[PDB]
Structure formats: structure tokens, C-alpha cells
Design a protein around this ligand. Structure first.
Ligand SMILES: [Zn+2]
Ligand SMILES: [Zn+2]
Ligand SMILES: [Zn+2]
Ligand SMILES: [Zn+2]
Lengths: 103, 220, 173, 83, 138, 80, 294
């Protein structure tokens, strides 16, 4: 991600499917995490959907998202919209040390 | 080893180059020097800023200590918020005023300095002095002397500069053939104030884009 | 092109110099130093014009003309054979050296008499490597004033190399 | 960690977009990318393709297109030499 | 509003603090993206001219903010000039300067390819094969 | 180029490029001053570098002078 | 006035054959000259294959053309013309339609000085120009630079520009171009401002109009059509028309023309983003160009 570094992306040719994000992550452009003037709905490769993992938030990878993620107008011009399949495969050191921190 | 010692001399490299003075001693270790000379010496390319090879992280500058914090663009300084809020060691203003400052007053306004195609900012550089320089090449012209430099020179009003007498024997400035000065080539009765002479030009549109009208967007 | 200016009051500033000399000719550049230690002007500047014609013009008209802060403003415009000779006689004067080496070649400067070890030696500056070769050929290991003198090239290691004849030939040209 | 990710994204972007100069790239490797992209656009735009067709004077335009395609590989020079 | 910004970024990008240079570059990102194609390139040229010296600046935040800024400048200026800088620094002996600029050229090759095609400084004396079809004139 | 001289620093030698004696060796050598020759070390190479540094038709009356040079036809003005 | 590969020869009229009256050696940058054009016999603009336009001036008694300005970037110029003394039209092998202008710093110098003093003699250049000569001799060799004035991308390859003082008696002089793949199009200079302000706002509307439809269609799905609906293709306008280099001052009317075909519901849906005049006056201003400007 733009902020947390260790988060790894997918970057495959996106399919017809649309990625879901949770209400908690709602409003973020999955690349830059910007809240302004979203444009196009994210599309993920079929390899990131399949079963239960399809319901996950493409951003935080944990929660089950209702909402669709949109790219912003800055990423749609930077072309990162079409770069590939955005997803976060690894949960990341932040979330990890958070979970192990609490319990 | 052998590849490091295989390198051609920089002067051997100069001959391949149409503009040989850009190439430098370190180009000898360019892994592809014949190519790098062609690219670096290509017409419109802008050589890498030279602050590399210095370990100072590009700013150690002593000059950085003496840089002014900031100065408002005079058009924005007109808005008077400078007095309303003191930044140096509520404030409500008119929408029409601010909007007109950016649009009505400041549409044609542009920063005075900017920079050019190949201008690159090196550490020791400071643009401000060059701004007063360019503005000064504009205001100040020969034949005129400000009252401050006149007082320092101790030249009273109505009296010609001391180089007008040596200019009588030596002749007019080679750089200013059209220059006129009172008492010599120019009418002494037209001597006035700070101007003892002026250049008389001997030379004596629409640019397809002339707008012929200027109308800014109105806020209301 | 570039002219030196001096006897300047540190209160004279850059804009004041510019406005001063633009009255004479167009000024390409002005280098007007600023002391970092004292945070003051050190009282002399350099004005680079657009050519040595306007430069020399400003030198002629400007010198001893403008009076700034009661102080006058000043303006001023901005490789040879060497033979070491050992065991000279104490009766050998520098002018006598001049007379001795004039017949072989013209001297660009005067000889330099110094003492090594007691041992009187001198440096003789010739304008020509070939005339230096003449004074060497004739005067090497010779007896003057009843004393045997040795004439060779002075060290720089010593003069007279192959590139030395080449470039000294050019400096002659 | 961050730079280490930039290495992986270097591998991915290099895979997708083919030639991307990383740090050390031979002039033969990079100039090949230059030639390939220039020819790519010359044949890619029907515009510039029509243009090169006439200026070259070939009998048909697809001769110019497939010419550029063939011209992308290095051995095509020797191939023309063997005709 | 772009012109009234540039004298402020004048002291920002010039400032010694990598933080001010960082966030100023973040300004140039959005400002350049949304103002690109308006005709302010002459101001964008300035803003960039102050950025180029910061390319060698290390640290992850500084390097990514500056990369994104330069990529935003690629859209407002167009590659050609942005290229010209990248080219005159493209190879270089320094093993460091090279690693730094090939990052910007990687992102440029990602966003633009055909856009850079006319702008390759390649001549028949520059490279052996060149392309025989670029000199054709009708 | 300078007396096979020794320098103890690279900044200093880079300052040798603009100097009185260095320019005297160049200019008196026949290699003119300033900024093209900066990277010089040996005397030889800059000699070939300096060698690297250093058809109009005025139509005579017989209509064969379309090959004839300007100055030549002026000489035939002085002859005519 | 002919151009060799390197150099520009000016042939006179001799008998039994034609003679070389003068020859001008090009700057080192120019390999070949594709096309070139003149302004009232005083000035020239000389194009290249690889490099871009460079303007020359004929100096009588100097019998030579002197380059007084370079060009900013590398552009492959197929055809080139003059709108004016100080500005130039040019196209690209790759389809860019651009127009450049000499800087006022250069226009003051050439207006106030004779060309004979440019090559040799005294011409006083501001401190910055010379420092750009010793600092960057390769780019600034021609001691001035074209500030980009107009830039545009027409996917065709422009064969012929022609500057017509009037198009069917219209006041605003246009420039019409025929492309190689075939096309004819025009660039009309807009008088005043609010002409280009209204046009600019309409182009801004139609630019993301497909996205506006997508966000409305999105909100109605939140309370209860793809993204490229109105454009039919994913390309943004500013993106497509920008392409090689960003369009600078040129507003594209070929877009605003598409506003005419849309249904009244769609048009009234788009124009609500403006506090300005109604759809009817929009269509008025759009259709005004073909009527009045040609
Ligand atoms: Zn995926
Ligand atoms: Zn989430
Ligand atoms: Zn985004
Ligand atoms: Zn030396």
C-alpha cells in the first residue's frame, strides 16, 4: 500500500469481477488510500475471488466487505487503475503486531 | 581490472563529440562512453545536477541559514490579511475582494522569476538576488542616477557627472552610440532631476491571437 | 573584458555599483565579494563587461573620476629555460654572469646566486632551449676566474626533457 | 523492506512491460527496447504505418507493417543480406 | 490558483528540511495531476527545476513522494522535457546516480511508452542499427 | 602539460584548468584558451583536438561563370 | 530558397544553369530539413527529421541566415507554417499539432536591433542568457527557446497547413490542415475570453460526463450502465488528446460537438453543473463556431 510498506499486491490482469471493501475501509482508493472523487470500480483477477476470500476487503484483507472499491481520479490518470489486480495478500506487520499486541 | 584499464582517454572521447566541452573526466569510466557522450551532448538534454559526488545530502548550505522565511506575492499582500493576522513573532474579509484578487486583479499576474528550460537549482544558488538583478536591468538605464547614489557621489543637482568631461575628450561610450547627455550631444535645458541624458533610438501586430477583450469569471 | 575596481567603501552596494557603471558601458556581470566572517563588503569589486573595448573604455574614463563616500574609486585592468650552475668563483658578480651568458642567449630574468653545502651556485634563465644548449655545450666543465664551473639544467626531475623542447619551442613561437 | 518490495515490483513491471532499465543495462539490451518500441508505434498507428508505406514506396502497406515486425528481431538484417 | 502557489513552493522545495521538501512534493503531485494540460507548464517547468536536485535524496518517504511528484510532472509537462532531464542523467558512471534515475525512467516507461517514442535521443551515429524508416520523408 | 608538475589534490588540479601558467602553456603552445580544453592532461591529445577546432557562384557574362567564384568575378570587375 | 541535407543554399538565376547566390551552414544539431517556411522574406522556420524547428533571419550584406531561436524539445516536423512573425505552426510525424512562439525577451531584441549585429557585433543579452550559454551550450546554443504556446494531438499525420485570413468572409482568421490519412480540420483563435471560458467549461463537462453518469447510476444503486457509457470507450478526453504532450491552450471543439447529439434529458443533466446559461444557450455557443467562425 501507499503507507504500509510490507503490504504486497497482486498485479494480474483484472477480470470482470469487482473487489469488495468493508464499511471500515469505505472510501479509500485501494492504491493511494484517497477519499476524493472516485472514478472506476476496482476489478480483480478470478484468482483473487473464488470462495470465501472473495468477500474479504481487498484493502484490509480481513473483514468482509459490502461496498465496491473505486479508483480515484488521480490514480485513473496515473494509470495505476489499469496496472493490475490490487489486493493485499500478506496481512502486514502493522495488523500482525496489533493482533499479537492485544492478544 | 582489464575493463577498468581498457578505458579510452577523455580527449580521445572529445573528438567523437560535437560539443566537446560538456564531457568531463569522470566520463572515462562511463561503461558505454561513446554512447553517453552522444546522449549527454545531444541537443536539448539537460545535464544532471552536479550536487552528486558530494556527500552533503545536497543541502549543507551556509546560504540556507540566511534565507528569508517567506514573502507574500504583492497581489496577495494587497488583501491586507498581513495586518489582520500577525505571522511574525476574526480576520474576516470580503468574498468579492479575495475572489477579485485572484481573478479580477490577478488573472494576468505571474511570478516574476520562474526559471527556464534548462535552469537547475544548485545548492549555493539564490534566485532572489537574480530577481532584483533582472528587475534592475529593467528599471536602471544609462543617463539616469538615483538620488541615493547621487548623494553618495556628492553630485549636486544641475551638475553633470564627472565622467562627462573625460567623455568630452574620450568620446561617447562605445557601448552606447545613441546615448545623449546634456551639454554635449543633448540639450542642457532638458537636464532635469536625476536624468542627465537619455538614449535616442535611431530605429524609428495582434499576433493572430489578440483577444481584444478580457473578461474574468464573476463570483456572484 | 573584466575590470578590477578598488578603494570602495563597504557601504557601496551592488545595485549602486551597477547603476554607477551602466552609465559608462553595459555591464555583463558583477562579482562584488561579501566577507562571511565579518558579514561585510571587503571594498573591492570586479565588473565584467561585454568586451575589452568597453572594458578599456571604462578603464580610461572611469579611473580617478567618481568620488564615492569621499574616497576615490580605482580601476585597474586584470615557462622559460633554467640552468643550474655549480662551483662558481667568489669573484663572479651577477652582472658578470649576465655578460657571460648574453653571448650565448638572451636572459629573460637575472641570475640567482645561492650557496649550497660554501658552494656557490646560480640559476640562469634563458629565453631559448637551444641557446641554453649553446651555453651548456661551451660552458660545461669550464674554468672561469680560475674555477671549474658546471653548467646543466636546473631541477623542476631536471629540465630539458623531450616534451620540454617541444613546449618551450612553442612558447618561443 | 520498502526497497525490497521495490525489487519485487521491479520483477513484475519488468515482466509485464518487458524492458525496464533497472540499474546496469547493456546498451545492446536497452537499444533493442528502443528499436522495438519505435517500430512498435510506427506499425501500431495506422497513421504512421500509412506514412512509412508511401515514403518507402512499397507495393503494399502490409509489406511495411510486417517489415517492421520482422525488423524487430536482430537477425532480420542478415536475413535481408541473404536475399 | 497555480501561479500564486509557486512562490510558496519556492521556499518549500528549497528548504533544508527533508520534511518540507517531502510535503511540498506531495503538493506538486495533486496540483500537477489536476492542473495538467491547463497550460501552466512554464510554472510546472519551474516547480520541476527545483525538484530534479531532490531525486538523489534517500529515505523511503522522500523517495516515493519525489517519484510520485515527478510522475505528476510527466503529465503536466509531457515526457519530452522531463525526458530531457532523465536522458542527460540516464546512464552516467556513478552507479548511484544511475540507480536513482533508472527509477524515474522505470516509472516513465510504465506510464508512457509510445509517448516517449519520438523523444528517444537516438541517431544513426548514436546506435549501430538505429531504424532505417525514421528518416523517410515524402 | 605543466612541467610534468605534481599536484596533491584533485580539487586543486581541477583548479589548474583555470590558471595563469596553464593557459600560458596552452596559448603559447598554440592551443587557444578557455573551456573546451579543460580536461587536458598530456600535451599531445589536445593538439589533435585543436586541429579539430581549426562555394558561391557569381555568373560571369559568357554564361560559363556559373562556376565562377564571387571574389574571382570581382577581380574580373577590376580587370574589366 | 532550398535546403540541403545539412545546409541551406539560396540559388539565384544564372544562364546555362542556376547559381549558388549564398550558402548558410546549419547548427550542428540539424541532420536534415523536412520542411521550412518563410515570413515576408525576412524570417525563416526550418524543420528537421529528428530535431525541431529553428528560426533564421536573412541578413543582407551579411548574405547569410542567422539562427536566433532554438526549440524546446525534440519534435519530428513534417509540415510547418507561420501564423505571424513571432509564431510558428508545426505538425509531427507522430500526429502532434503544435504552435510555438518566440519569447518577448527575443522579440524586444530583434525589434530593437538589426540582424547584422547578431552574428558578429554588439548585442547586449541579459546575464541569464550567457550563463545558459556557458552552462548549457548544447540546448541554449541558439541563445533563445520557444515557450510552448499551443499543443494538440490529432491522430492523423498533418500534410498541409494553410493560414486563411478569412474562412468564408469570417472575421477570425483560421488555419486549416489536411492530414495524410486524410482529414481537414481547423484551429480558430478565440477572441475575448469568456468565449474560451464557456467553451472550456463545456469541454470540461463533456470530458468526465461518462463518469458523472456512472456516479449518478452508482448513487441510484445505493438507494436501490458501465463507466465508459457516455464515451463508449475508456479513454478520457484530456488523456487521449494529451497523449504525447499535454494540450496547452487548445480547447477541443470536436468534443463539445458531441454534446449536440445527446438527448435533452442527458444534456440538461450535464449542464446543471454550471451556474451559467441553460442548455439552449450552450447549444447556441457550440453551433456558433461553424456559422460565424467559417
Ligand atoms: Zn488478483
Ligand atoms: Zn477493509
Ligand atoms: Zn488513487
Ligand atoms: Zn596543467
Amino acid at each position: 500500500s501507499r503507507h504500509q510498506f510490507d503490504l504486497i499486491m497482486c498485479l494480474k490482469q483484472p477480470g470482470v469481477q469487482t473487489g469488495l471493501l468493508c464499511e471500515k475501509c469505505d472510501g479509500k482508493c485501494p492504491i493511494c488510500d484517497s477519499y476524493v472523487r472516485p472514478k472506476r470500480k476496482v476489478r480483480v483477477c478470478e484468482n483473487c475471488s473464488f470462495g470465501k476470500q472473495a468477500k474479504n476487503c481487498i484493502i484490509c484483507n480481513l473483514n468482509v466487505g459490502v461496498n465496491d472499491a473505486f479508483y480515484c481520479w488521480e490514480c485513473c490518470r496515473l494509470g495505476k487503475d489499469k496496472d493490475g489486480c490490487p489486493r493485499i495478500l500478506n496481512l502486514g506487520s502493522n495488523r500482525l503486531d496489533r493482533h499479537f499486541e492485544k492478544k | 581490472k582489464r575493463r577498468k584499464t581498457e578505458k579510452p582517454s577523455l580527449s580521445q572521447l572529445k573528438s567523437q563529440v560535437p560539443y566537446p566541452q560538456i564531457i568531463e573526466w569522470y566520463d572515462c569510466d562511463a561503461r558505454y562512453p561513446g554512447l553517453l557522450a552522444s546522449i549527454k551532448c545531444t541537443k536539448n538534454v539537460i545535464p544532471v545536477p552536479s550536487h552528486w559526488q558530494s556527500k552533503k545530502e545536497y543541502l549543507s548550505g551556509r546560504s540556507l541559514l540566511g534565507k528569508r522565511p517567506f514573502e507574500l506575492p504583492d497581489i496577495i499582500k494587497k488583501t491586507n490579511i498581513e495586518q489582520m493576522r500577525s505571522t511574525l513573532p476574526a480576520l474576516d474579509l470580503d468574498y468579492k475582494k479575495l475572489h477579485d484578487v485572484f481573478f479580477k486583479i490577478g488573472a494576468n499576474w505571474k511570478p516574476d522569476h520562474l526559471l527556464c528550460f534548462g535552469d537547475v537549482y544548485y545548492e549555493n544558488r539564490n534566485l532572489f538576488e537574480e530577481t532584483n538583478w533582472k528587475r534592475m536591468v529593467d528599471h536602471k538605464r544609462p543617463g539616469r542616477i538615483s538620488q541615493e547614489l547621487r548623494a553618495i557621489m556628492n553630485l549636486p543637482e544641475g551638475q553633470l557627472p564627472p565622467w562627462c568631461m573625460k567623455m568630452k575628450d574620450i568620446g561617447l561610450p562605445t557601448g552606447y552610440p545613441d546615448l545623449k547627455i546634456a551639454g554635449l550631444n543633448w540639450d542642457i535645458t532638458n537636464l532635469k532631476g536625476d536624468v542627465y541624458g537619455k538614449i535616442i533610438p535611431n530605429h524609428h501586430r495582434n499576433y493572430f491571437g489578440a483577444l481584444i477583450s478580457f473578461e474574468t469569471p464573476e463570483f456572484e | 573584458n573584466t575590470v578590477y575596481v578598488g578603494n570602495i567603501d563597504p557601504r557601496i552596494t551592488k545595485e549602486q555599483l551597477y547603476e554607477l557603471f551602466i552609465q559608462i558601458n553595459p555591464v555583463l556581470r558583477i562579482k562584488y565579494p561579501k566577507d562571511k566572517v565579518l558579514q561585510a563588503y571587503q571594498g573591492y569589486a570586479f565588473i565584467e563587461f561585454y568586451n575589452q573595448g568597453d572594458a578599456q573604455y571604462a578603464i580610461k574614463i572611469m579611473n580617478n573620476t567618481v568620488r564615492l563616500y569621499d574616497r576615490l574609486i580605482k580601476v585597474r585592468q586584470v615557462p622559460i629555460a633554467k640552468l643550474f650552475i655549480k662551483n662558481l668563483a667568489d669573484s663572479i658578480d651577477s652582472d658578470q654572469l649576465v655578460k657571460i651568458f648574453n653571448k650565448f642567449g638572451k636572459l629573460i630574468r637575472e641570475p640567482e646566486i645561492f650557496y649550497l653545502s660554501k658552494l656557490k651556485c646560480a640559476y640562469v634563465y634563458f629565453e631559448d632551449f637551444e641557446k641554453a644548449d649553446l651555453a651548456i655545450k661551451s660552458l660545461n666543465n669550464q674554468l672561469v676566474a680560475n674555477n671549474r664551473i658546471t653548467v646543466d639544467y636546473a631541477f623542476k626531475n631536471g629540465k630539458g626533457n623531450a616534451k620540454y623542447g617541444d613546449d618551450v619551442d612553442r612558447l618561443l613561437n | 523492506a520498502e526497497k525490497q518490495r521495490q525489487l519485487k515490483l521491479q520483477k513484475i513491471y519488468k515482466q509485464k512491460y518487458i524492458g525496464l532499465g533497472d540499474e546496469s543495462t547493456t546498451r545492446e539490451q536497452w537499444q533493442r527496447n528502443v528499436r522495438n518500441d519505435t517500430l512498435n508505434t510506427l506499425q501500431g498507428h495506422s497513421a504512421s504505418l500509412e506514412y512509412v508505406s508511401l515514403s518507402r514506396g512499397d507495393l503494399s502497406i502490409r509489406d511495411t507493417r510486417i517489415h517492421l515486425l520482422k525488423s524487430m528481431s536482430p537477425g532480420y538484417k542478415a536475413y535481408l543480406r541473404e536475399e | 490558483y497555480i501561479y500564486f502557489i509557486t512562490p510558496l513552493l519556492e521556499d518549500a522545495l528549497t528548504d533544508r528540511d527533508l520534511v518540507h521538501r517531502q510535503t511540498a512534493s506531495n503538493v506538486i503531485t495533486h496540483l500537477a495531476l489536476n492542473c495538467s494540460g491547463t497550460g501552466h507548464e512554464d510554472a510546472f517547468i519551474h516547480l520541476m527545476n527545483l525538484l530534479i536536485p531532490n531525486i538523489f535524496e534517500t529515505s523511503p518517504h522522500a523517495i516515493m513522494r519525489i517519484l510520485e511528484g515527478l510522475e505528476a510532472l510527466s503529465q503536466a509537462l509531457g515526457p519530452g522535457l522531463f525526458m530531457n532531464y532523465i536522458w542527460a542523467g540516464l546512464f552516467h558512471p556513478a552507479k548511484n546516480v544511475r540507480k536513482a534515475f533508472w527509477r524515474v525512467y522505470n516509472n516513465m516507461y510504465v506510464m508512457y511508452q509510445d509517448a516517449m517514442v519520438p523523444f528517444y535521443p537516438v541517431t544513426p551515429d548514436n546506435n549501430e542499427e538505429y531504424i532505417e524508416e525514421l528518416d523517410l520523408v515524402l | 602539460i605543466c612541467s610534468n608538475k605534481v599536484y596533491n589534490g584533485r580539487r586543486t588540479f581541477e583548479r589548474h584548468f583555470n590558471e595563469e601558467r596553464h593557459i600560458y602553456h596552452l596559448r603559447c603552445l598554440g592551443i587557444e584558451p578557455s573551456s573546451v580544453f579543460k580536461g587536458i592532461t598530456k600535451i599531445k591529445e589536445a593538439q589533435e583536438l585543436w586541429k579539430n577546432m581549426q562555394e558561391l557562384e557569381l555568373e560571369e557574362e559568357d554564361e560559363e561563370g556559373n562556376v565562377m567564384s564571387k571574389k574571382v568575378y570581382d577581380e574580373l570587375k577590376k580587370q574589366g | 530558397l532550398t535546403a540541403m541535407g545539412s545546409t541551406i543554399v539560396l540559388y539565384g538565376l544564372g544562364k546555362k544553369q542556376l547559381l549558388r547566390r549564398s550558402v548558410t551552414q546549419t547548427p550542428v544539431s540539424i541532420t536534415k530539413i523536412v520542411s521550412m517556411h518563410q515570413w515576408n522574406y525576412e524570417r525563416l522556420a526550418v524543420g528537421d527529421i529528428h530535431e525541431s524547428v529553428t528560426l533564421f533571419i536573412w541578413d543582407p550584406a551579411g548574405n547569410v541566415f542567422i539562427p536566433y531561436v532554438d526549440d524546446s524539445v525534440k519534435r519530428h516536423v513534417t509540415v510547418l507554417k507561420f501564423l505571424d512573425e513571432a509564431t510558428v505552426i508545426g505538425a509531427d510525424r507522430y500526429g502532434n499539432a503544435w504552435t510555438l512562439r518566440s519569447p518577448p525577451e527575443c522579440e524586444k531584441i530583434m525589434s530593437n536591433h538589426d540582424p547584422s549585429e547578431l552574428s558578429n557585433g554588439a548585442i547586449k543579452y541579459p546575464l541569464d542568457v550567457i550563463t545558459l550559454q556557458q552552462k548549457l551550450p548544447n540546448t541554449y546554443d541558439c541563445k533563445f527557446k520557444f515557450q510552448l504556446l499551443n499543443h494538440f494531438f490529432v491522430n492523423d499525420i498533418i500534410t498541409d497547413f494553410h493560414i486563411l485570413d478569412s474562412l468564408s468572409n469570417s472575421d477570425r482568421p483560421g488555419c486549416i490542415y489536411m492530414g495524410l490519412q486524410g482529414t481537414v480540420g481547423c484551429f480558430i483563435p478565440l477572441l475575448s475570453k469568456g468565449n474560451v471560458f464557456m467553451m472550456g467549461n463545456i469541454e470540461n463537462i463533456m470530458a468526465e460526463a461518462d463518469d458523472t453518469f456512472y456516479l449518478d447510476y452508482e448513487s441510484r444503486k445505493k438507494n436501490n450502465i458501465c463507466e465508459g457509457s457516455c464515451s463508449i470507450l475508456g479513454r478520457d478526453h484530456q488523456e487521449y488528446r494529451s497523449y504525447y504532450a499535454p494540450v496547452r491552450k487548445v480547447i477541443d471543439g470536436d468534443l463539445c460537438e458531441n454534446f449536440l447529439r445527446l438527448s435533452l434529458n442527458e444534456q440538461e443533466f450535464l449542464a446543471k453543473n454550471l451556474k451559467s446559461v441553460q442548455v439552449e444557450d450552450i447549444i447556441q455557443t457550440i453551433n456558433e463556431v461553424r456559422t460565424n467562425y467559417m
